[PDB]
Amino acid sequence: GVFTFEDEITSTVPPAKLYNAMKDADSITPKIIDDVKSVEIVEGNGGPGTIKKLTIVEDGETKFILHKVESIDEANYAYNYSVVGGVALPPTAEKITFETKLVEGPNGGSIGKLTLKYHTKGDAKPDEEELKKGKAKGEGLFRAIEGYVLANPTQY
Ligand SMILES: Oc1cc(O)c2c(c1)O[C@H](c1ccc(O)c(O)c1)[C@H](O)C2
Numbered sequence: 001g002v003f004t005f006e007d008e009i010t011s012t013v014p015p016a017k018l019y020n021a022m023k024d025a026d027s028i029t030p031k032i033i034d035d036v037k038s039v040e041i042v043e044g045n046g047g048p049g050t051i052k053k054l055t056i057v058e059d060g061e062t063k064f065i066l067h068k069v070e071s072i073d074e075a076n077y078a079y080n081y082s083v084v085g086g087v088a089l090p091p092t093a094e095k096i097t098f099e100t101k102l103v104e105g106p107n108g109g110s111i112g113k114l115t116l117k118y119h120t121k122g123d124a125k126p127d128e129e130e131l132k133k134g135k136a137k138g139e140g141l142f143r144a145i146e147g148y149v150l151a152n153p154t155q156y
């Protein structure tokens with residue numbers, strides 16, 4: 001069953017710059033989020049279809065997360081990936097997809113339109129706590145990437 005949710009978030013960064021930074025998420029996140037220890041390609045080239053493994057600590061404990069790159073519509077500033085395994089996939093969920101689209105924002109900025117697509121085994125529904133975490137992973141990344149660009153003018 002599919003359950004979809006949409007959120008918006010604004011930034012004073014132009015979408016072109018924000019989008020280049022998003023593509024470099026594997027590099028950026030281990031530097032800026034203490035809990036993220038490593039992002040590595042298992043299979044694929046980095047492009048849509050690529051599977052990645054992530055070493056993360058959650059409440060002091062080492063854990064693993066599996067990502068699949070879904071699509072990278074460059075002309076429309078779009079980066080989609082999904083969580084297909086590990087701690088951040090609930091036992092009742094097949095897959096959780098995080099979409100991110102960037103369009104123009106006030107005063108030279110952009111608005112991030114985020115989309116959460118939750119795929120569940122059978123007819124189980126995402127629980128309220130799962131969804132709360134999902135939206136927070138969504139804003140959190142955008143916020144993290146966003147913080148990186150604001151702190152680093154000279155390179156995007
Ligand atoms: O604010 C956070 C906190 C996290 O624990 C994570 C965040 C953001 O995003 C990470 C992430 C998300 C997408 C990527 O392509 C990537 O290399 C890393 C990961 O989900 C783990």
Ligand code: NA
Nearest residue numbers: 030033034036
């Ligand atoms: Na780190």
